[PDB]
CSV table of C-alpha atoms and ligand atoms in Angstrom, one decimal:
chain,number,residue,atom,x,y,z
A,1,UNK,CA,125.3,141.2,83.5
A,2,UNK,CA,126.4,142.7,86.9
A,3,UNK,CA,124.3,143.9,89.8
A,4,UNK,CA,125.2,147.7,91.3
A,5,UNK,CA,124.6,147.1,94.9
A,6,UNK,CA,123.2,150.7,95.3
A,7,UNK,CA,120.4,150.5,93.1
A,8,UNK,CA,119.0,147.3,94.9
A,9,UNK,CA,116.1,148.8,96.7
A,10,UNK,CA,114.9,146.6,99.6
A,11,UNK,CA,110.9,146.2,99.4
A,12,UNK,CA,110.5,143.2,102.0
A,13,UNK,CA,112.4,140.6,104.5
A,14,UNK,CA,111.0,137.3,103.2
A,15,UNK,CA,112.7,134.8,104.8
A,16,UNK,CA,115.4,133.5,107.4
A,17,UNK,CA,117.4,130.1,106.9
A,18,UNK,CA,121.2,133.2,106.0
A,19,UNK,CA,118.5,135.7,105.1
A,20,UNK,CA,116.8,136.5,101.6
A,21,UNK,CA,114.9,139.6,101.0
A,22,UNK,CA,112.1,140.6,97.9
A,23,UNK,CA,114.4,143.7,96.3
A,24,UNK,CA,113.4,145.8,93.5
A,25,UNK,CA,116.7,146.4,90.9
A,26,UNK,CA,115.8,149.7,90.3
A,27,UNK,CA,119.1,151.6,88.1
A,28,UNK,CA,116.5,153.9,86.2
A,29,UNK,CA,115.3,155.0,89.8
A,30,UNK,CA,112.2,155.5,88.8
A,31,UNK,CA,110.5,151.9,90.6
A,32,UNK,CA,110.1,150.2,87.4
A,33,UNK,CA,112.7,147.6,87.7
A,34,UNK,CA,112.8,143.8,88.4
A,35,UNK,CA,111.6,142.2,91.6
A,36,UNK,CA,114.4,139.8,92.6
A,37,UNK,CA,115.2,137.9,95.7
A,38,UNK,CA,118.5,138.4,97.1
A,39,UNK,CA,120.5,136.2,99.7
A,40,UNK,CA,122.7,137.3,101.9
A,41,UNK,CA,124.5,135.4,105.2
A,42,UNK,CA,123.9,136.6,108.0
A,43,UNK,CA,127.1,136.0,109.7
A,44,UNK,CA,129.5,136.4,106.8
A,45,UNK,CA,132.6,134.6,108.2
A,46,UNK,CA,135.9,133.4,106.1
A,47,UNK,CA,134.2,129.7,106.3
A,48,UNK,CA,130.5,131.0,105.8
A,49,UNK,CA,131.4,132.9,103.2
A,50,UNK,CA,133.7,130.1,101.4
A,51,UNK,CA,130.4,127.5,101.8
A,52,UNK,CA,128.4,130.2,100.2
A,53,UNK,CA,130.2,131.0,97.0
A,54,UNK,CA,130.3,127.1,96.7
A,55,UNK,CA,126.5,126.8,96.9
A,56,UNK,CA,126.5,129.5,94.4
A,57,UNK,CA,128.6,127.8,91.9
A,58,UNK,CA,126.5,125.1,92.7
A,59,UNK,CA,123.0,127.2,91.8
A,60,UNK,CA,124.6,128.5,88.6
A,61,UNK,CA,125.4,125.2,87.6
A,62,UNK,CA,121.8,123.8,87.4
A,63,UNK,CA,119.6,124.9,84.6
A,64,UNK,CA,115.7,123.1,85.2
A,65,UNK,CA,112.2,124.2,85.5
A,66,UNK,CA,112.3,123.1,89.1
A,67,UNK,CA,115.2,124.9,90.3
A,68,UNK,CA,114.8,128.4,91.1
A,69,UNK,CA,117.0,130.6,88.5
A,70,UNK,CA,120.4,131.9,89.1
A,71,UNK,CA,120.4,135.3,88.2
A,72,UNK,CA,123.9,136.9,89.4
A,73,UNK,CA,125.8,138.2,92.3
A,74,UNK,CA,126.2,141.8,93.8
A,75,UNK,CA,129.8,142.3,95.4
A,76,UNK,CA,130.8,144.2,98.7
A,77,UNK,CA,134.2,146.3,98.4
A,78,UNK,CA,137.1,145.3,100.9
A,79,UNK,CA,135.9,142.2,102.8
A,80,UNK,CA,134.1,140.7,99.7
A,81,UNK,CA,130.7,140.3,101.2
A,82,UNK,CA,128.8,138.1,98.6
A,83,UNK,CA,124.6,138.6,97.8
A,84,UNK,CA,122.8,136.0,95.8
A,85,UNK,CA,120.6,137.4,93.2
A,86,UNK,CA,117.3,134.9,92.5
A,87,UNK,CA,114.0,135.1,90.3
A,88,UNK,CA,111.2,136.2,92.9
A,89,UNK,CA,108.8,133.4,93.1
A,90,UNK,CA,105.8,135.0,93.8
A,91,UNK,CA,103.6,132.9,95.7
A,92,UNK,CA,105.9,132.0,98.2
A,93,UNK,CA,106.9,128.8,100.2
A,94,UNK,CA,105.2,125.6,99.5
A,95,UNK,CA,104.9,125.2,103.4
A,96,UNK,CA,103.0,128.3,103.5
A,97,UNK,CA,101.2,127.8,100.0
A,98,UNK,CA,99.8,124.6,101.1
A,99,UNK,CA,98.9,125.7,105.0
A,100,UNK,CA,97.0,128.4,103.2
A,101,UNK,CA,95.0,126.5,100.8
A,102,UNK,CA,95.1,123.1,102.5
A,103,UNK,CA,92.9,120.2,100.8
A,104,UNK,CA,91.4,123.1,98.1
A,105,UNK,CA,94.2,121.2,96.9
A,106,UNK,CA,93.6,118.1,95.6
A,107,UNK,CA,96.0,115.1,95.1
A,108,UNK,CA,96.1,115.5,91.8
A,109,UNK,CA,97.6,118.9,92.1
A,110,UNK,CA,99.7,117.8,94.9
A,111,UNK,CA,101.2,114.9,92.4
A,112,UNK,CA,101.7,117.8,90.1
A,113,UNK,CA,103.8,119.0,92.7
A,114,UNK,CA,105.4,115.5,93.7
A,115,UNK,CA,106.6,115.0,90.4
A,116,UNK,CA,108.4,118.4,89.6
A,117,UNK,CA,110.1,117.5,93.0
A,118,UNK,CA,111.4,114.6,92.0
A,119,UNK,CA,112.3,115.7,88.1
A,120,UNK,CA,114.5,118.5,89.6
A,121,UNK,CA,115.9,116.0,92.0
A,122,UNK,CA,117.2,113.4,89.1
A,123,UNK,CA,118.6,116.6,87.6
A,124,UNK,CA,120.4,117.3,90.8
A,125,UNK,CA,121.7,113.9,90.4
A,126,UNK,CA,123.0,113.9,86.9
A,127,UNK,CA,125.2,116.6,88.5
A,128,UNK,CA,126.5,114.4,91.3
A,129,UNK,CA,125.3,116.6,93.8
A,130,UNK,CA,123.6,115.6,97.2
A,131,UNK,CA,121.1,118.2,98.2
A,132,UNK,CA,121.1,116.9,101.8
A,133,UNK,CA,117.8,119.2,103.3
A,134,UNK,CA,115.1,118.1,100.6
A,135,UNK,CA,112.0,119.2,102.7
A,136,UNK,CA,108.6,121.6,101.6
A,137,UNK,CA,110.5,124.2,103.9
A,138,UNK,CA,112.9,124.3,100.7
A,139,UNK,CA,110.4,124.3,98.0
A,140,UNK,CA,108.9,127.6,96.7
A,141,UNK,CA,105.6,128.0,94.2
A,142,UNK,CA,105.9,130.0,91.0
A,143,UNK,CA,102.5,129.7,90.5
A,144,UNK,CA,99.5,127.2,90.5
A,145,UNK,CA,101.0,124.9,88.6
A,146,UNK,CA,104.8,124.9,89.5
A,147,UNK,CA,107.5,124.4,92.4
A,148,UNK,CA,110.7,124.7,92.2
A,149,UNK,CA,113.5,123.7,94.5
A,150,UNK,CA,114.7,127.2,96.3
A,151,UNK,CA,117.7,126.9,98.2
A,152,UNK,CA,121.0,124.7,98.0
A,153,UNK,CA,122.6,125.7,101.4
A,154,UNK,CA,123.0,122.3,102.2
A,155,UNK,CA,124.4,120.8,99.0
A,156,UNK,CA,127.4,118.8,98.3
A,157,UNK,CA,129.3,117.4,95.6
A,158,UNK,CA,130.6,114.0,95.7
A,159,UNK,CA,133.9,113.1,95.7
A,160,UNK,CA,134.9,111.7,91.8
A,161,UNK,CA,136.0,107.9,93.4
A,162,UNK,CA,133.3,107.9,96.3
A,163,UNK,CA,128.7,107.6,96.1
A,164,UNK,CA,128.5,109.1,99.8
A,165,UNK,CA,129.5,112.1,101.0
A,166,UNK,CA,130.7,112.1,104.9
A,167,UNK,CA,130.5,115.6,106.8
A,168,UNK,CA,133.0,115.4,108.8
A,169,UNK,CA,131.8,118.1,112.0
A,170,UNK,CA,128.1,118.7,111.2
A,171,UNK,CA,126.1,121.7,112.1
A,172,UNK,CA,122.1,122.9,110.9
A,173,UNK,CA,121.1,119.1,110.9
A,174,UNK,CA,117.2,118.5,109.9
A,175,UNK,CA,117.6,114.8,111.6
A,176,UNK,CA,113.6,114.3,111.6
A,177,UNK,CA,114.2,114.2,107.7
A,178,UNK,CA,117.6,112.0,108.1
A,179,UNK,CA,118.3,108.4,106.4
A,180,UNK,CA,119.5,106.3,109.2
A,181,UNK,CA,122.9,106.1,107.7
A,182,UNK,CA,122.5,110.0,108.0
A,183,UNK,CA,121.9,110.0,111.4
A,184,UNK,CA,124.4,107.2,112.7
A,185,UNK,CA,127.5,107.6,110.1
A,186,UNK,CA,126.7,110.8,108.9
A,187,UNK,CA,126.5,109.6,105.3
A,188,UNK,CA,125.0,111.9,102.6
A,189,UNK,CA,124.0,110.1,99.3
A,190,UNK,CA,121.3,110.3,96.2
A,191,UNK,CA,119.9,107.2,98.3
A,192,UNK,CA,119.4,109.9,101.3
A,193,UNK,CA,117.8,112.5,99.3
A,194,UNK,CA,115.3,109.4,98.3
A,195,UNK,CA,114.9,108.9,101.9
A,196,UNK,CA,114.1,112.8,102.4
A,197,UNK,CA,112.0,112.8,99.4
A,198,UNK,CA,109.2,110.1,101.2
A,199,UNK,CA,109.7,112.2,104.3
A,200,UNK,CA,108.3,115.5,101.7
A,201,UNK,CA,105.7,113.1,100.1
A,202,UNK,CA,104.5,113.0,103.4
A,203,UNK,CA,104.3,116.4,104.1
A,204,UNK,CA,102.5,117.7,101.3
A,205,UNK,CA,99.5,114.8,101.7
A,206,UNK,CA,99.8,116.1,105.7
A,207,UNK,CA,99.0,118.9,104.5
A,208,UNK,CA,101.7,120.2,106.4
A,209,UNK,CA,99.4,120.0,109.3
A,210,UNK,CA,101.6,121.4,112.5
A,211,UNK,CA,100.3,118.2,114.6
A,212,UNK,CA,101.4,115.5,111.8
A,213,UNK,CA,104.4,117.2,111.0
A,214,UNK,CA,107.7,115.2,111.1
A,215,UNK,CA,109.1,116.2,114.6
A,216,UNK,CA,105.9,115.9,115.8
A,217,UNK,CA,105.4,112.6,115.0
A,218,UNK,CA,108.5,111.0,115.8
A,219,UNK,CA,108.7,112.8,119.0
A,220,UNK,CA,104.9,111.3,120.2
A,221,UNK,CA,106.9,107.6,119.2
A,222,UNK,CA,110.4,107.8,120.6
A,223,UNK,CA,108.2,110.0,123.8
A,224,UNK,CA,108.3,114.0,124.4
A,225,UNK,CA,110.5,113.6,127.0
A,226,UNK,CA,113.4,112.6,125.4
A,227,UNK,CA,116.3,116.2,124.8
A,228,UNK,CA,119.0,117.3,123.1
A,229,UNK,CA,121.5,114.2,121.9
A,230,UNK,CA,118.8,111.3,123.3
A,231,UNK,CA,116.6,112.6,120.4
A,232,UNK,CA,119.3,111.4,118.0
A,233,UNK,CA,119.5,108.4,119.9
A,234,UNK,CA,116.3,107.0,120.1
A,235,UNK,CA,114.9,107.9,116.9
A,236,UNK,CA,118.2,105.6,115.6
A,237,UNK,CA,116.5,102.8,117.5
A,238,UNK,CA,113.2,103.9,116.3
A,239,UNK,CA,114.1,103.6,112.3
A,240,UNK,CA,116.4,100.4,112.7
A,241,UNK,CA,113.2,98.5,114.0
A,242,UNK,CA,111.0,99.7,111.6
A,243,UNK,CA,109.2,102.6,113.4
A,244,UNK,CA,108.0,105.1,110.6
A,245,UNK,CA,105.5,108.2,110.1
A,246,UNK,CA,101.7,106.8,110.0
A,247,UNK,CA,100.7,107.1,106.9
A,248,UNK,CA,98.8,110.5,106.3
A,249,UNK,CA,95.1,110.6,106.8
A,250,UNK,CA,92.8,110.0,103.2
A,251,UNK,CA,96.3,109.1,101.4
A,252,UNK,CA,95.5,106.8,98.7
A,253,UNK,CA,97.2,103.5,98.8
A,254,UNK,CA,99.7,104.0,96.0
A,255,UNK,CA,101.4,107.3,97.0
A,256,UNK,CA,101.4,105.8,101.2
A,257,UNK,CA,103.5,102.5,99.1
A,258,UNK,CA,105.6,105.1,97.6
A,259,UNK,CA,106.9,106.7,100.9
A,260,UNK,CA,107.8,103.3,102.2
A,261,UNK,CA,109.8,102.2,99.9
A,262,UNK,CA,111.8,105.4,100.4
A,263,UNK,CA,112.2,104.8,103.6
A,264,UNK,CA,113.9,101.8,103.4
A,265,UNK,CA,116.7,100.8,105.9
A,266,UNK,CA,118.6,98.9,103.1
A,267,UNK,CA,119.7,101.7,100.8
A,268,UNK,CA,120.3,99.6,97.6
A,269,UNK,CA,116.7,98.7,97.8
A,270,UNK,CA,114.9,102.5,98.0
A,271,UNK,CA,114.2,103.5,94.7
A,272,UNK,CA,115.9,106.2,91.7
A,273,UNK,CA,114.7,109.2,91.0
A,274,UNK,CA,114.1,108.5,87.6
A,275,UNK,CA,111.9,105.6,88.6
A,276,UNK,CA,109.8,107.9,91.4
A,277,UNK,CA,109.2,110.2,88.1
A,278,UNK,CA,107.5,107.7,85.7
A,279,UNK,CA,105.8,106.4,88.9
A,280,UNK,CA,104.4,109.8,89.9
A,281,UNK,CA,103.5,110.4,86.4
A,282,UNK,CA,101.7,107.1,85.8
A,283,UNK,CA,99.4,107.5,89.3
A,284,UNK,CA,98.8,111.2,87.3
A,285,UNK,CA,97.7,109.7,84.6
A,286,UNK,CA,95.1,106.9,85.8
A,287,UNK,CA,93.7,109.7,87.4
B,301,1P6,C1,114.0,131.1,103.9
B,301,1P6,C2,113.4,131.6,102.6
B,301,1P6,N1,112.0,132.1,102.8
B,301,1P6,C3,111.2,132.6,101.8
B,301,1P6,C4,111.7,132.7,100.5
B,301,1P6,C5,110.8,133.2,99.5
B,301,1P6,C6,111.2,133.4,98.1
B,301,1P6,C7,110.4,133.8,97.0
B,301,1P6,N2,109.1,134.2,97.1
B,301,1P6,N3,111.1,133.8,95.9
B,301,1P6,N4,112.4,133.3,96.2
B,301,1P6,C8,113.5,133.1,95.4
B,301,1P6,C9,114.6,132.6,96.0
B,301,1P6,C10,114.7,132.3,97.3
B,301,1P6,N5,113.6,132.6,98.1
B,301,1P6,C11,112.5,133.0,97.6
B,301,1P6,N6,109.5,133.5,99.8
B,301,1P6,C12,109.1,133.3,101.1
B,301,1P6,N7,109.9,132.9,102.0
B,301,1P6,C13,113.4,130.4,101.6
B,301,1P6,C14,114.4,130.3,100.7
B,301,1P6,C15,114.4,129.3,99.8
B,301,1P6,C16,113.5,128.3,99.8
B,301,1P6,F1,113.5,127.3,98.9
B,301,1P6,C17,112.4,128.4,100.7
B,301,1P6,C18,112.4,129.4,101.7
């Protein structure tokens, strides 16, 4: 079913990346219609716009309680500007979600959380595709008891003869959630994702506290005076010897295990998906 452009009634900016907006489609006029969420670039180049309607092939393809739903696309006479139509997720970001509420909630909720992450990662993988920016920045709540991966920007499909994907002239690069082989070769696989999945499983027993986040922790250990291209440089030095995020204050023993084994240098040895799922689900249980 198609989307008239002209009966999408903007009710509020909700986030910048492009840009996604909370829109009412309102044909009737009368303000009863659906709230969506609808993403549009912000600089809608030939190239942009070519990445775009591949991530939105991408989004339509994927059909999983944990990925935010596809609903359809409004298009732009002449220059065939494209906007992303989304289900509105109501309670927003995980990052903010979970800054909000902090420790009212409790690991048990946040393993909820950890294992709907990694079910609609495996999913993701069944599909071949390499999500590449796994981080709570990318997660949104539906409600109290389900996230869902929100935004695919970042995704690539592997080639059919090839399990890496190399980008050949990289540009929005979150390195502070980067596999070495990421950072050094620029190699983007399901074993990089794992990698990016600890770095997550961090964040959310964090707390996403601004001190403990990421950056700020590996820029206290490879020293706040280090700029621009060194960063890349010394936290590549950092990782090969072994240098990793502390792990998270009151984080039981088990879930701390599990982000280390992610972060393994070796990337045959970090786990599946699959495997991070029964894991998840098992720590769940005993408690
Ligand atoms: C950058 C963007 N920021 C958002 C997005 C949303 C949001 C929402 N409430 N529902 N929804 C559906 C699809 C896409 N985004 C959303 N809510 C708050 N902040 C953002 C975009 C995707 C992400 F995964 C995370 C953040």
């Amino acid at each position: 079913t198609q989307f008239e452009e002209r009966h999408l009634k903007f009710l509020q900016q909700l986030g910048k990346g492009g840009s996604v907006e909370m829109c009412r489609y309102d044909p009737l006029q009368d303000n009863t219609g659906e709230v969506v969420a609808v993403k549009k670039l912000q600089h809608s180049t030939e190239e942009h716009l070519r990445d775009f309607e591949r991530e939105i092939e991408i989004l339509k393809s994927l059909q999983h309680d944990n990925i935010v739903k596809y609903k359809g696309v409004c298009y732009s006479a002449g220059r065939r500007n494209l906007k992303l139509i989304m289900e509105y997720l109501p309670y927003g970001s995980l990052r903010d979600y979970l800054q909000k509420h902090k420790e009212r909630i409790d690991h048990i909720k946040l393993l909820q959380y950890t294992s709907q992450i990694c079910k609609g990662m495996e999913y993701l993988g069944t599909k071949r595709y390499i999500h590449r920016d796994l981080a709570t920045r990318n997660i949104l709540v539906e409600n109290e008891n389900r996230v869902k991966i929100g935004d695919f920007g970042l995704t690539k499909v592997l080639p059919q003869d090839k399990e890496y994907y190399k980008v050949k002239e990289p540009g929005e690069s979150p390195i502070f959630w980067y596999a070495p082989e990421s950072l050094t070769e620029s190699k983007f696989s399901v074993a990089s994702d794992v990698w990016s999945f600890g770095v997550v499983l961090y964040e959310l027993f964090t707390y996403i506290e601004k001190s403990k986040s990421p950056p700020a922790e590996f820029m206290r250990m490879i020293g706040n005076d280090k700029q621009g291209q060194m960063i890349v440089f010394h936290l590549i030095e950092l990782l090969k010897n072994n240098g990793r995020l502390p792990r998270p204050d009151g984080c039981p023993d088990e879930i701390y295990m599990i982000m280390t084994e992610c972060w393994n240098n070796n990337v045959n040895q970090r786990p599946s998906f699959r495997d991070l799922a029964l894991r998840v689900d098992q720590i769940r249980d005993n408690m």
